[PDB]
Amino acid sequence: NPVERYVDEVLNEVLVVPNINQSHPTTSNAAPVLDAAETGHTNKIQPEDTIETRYVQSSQTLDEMSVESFLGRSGCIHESVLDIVDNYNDQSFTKWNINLQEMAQIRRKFEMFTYARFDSEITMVPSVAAKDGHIGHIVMQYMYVPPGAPIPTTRDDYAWQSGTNASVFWQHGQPFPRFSLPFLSIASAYYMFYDGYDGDTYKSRYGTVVTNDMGTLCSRIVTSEQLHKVKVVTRIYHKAKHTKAWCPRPPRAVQYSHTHTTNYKLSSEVHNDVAIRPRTNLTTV
């Protein structure tokens, strides 16, 4: 029933976990506790097989552990800065090559899978710092420039006309801008990892930089030069929607160093580079 399923959604009881059944003492030549990890399979033994369990009705649900839930939280992916210091024409606009590689928190979650397909919800949080006292009337323009489209080189570049590109105009005092983007790849899923190159020579590029071009985000303060200088910082947040993921993998164990690459740095004392905490010995809890 689309109404019974509705109730399960509100109560978050779509994916229930199995109950524990009562078990009894056993004496058999069937030894579930014994197996062979060499097979590459996990022993499917359950608590009822190793101890005498009581009957217990499980009420836990796995809804929150779903992929949609795990990757469905909006996190920061970029912090754009427009700092008016001494030249309005040069400092009132900027650009960013879009990617989800610059902020560790969301990057690590997505990288727990090899491939992922999803639509994106982008939410922007602009904050205007009054360096000289006033902020005046701040109006911002955020333009999505897909690869190939002309990139503005001045604050009055014709490209800002946005005759085809999508632009979002925000006015200080109005709610935070937000829009959705459909799965953008030319492939069936996004590559979280890519063991390939864009050629076959010693100078060919390696990794996701080869497959993950998302274009550029061009910003500018629409308002013309004002007496008082401001510093506008626009933080970009991303949330995956209608998500699918494939081939889970080991979580990032060391700090990230660069975008689109798994490269890392190691110090002289490696235990400082990983979350593992040195044990005094094998028997010290």
Binding site: N1, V3, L15, S66, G72, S120, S180, K241
Partner: peptide, 29 residues
């Protein structure tokens, strides 16, 4: 779109925009 259900407990699954990408989080399973 309005995916009206009935049971009376009527469910109104409304899609305010004309693109699939615009809707909220997906259902599970």
């Amino acid at each position: 779109g309005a995916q009206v259900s009935r049971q009376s407990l009527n469910y109104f699954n409304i899609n305010y925009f004309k693109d699939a990408a615009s809707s909220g989080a997906s259902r599970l399973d």
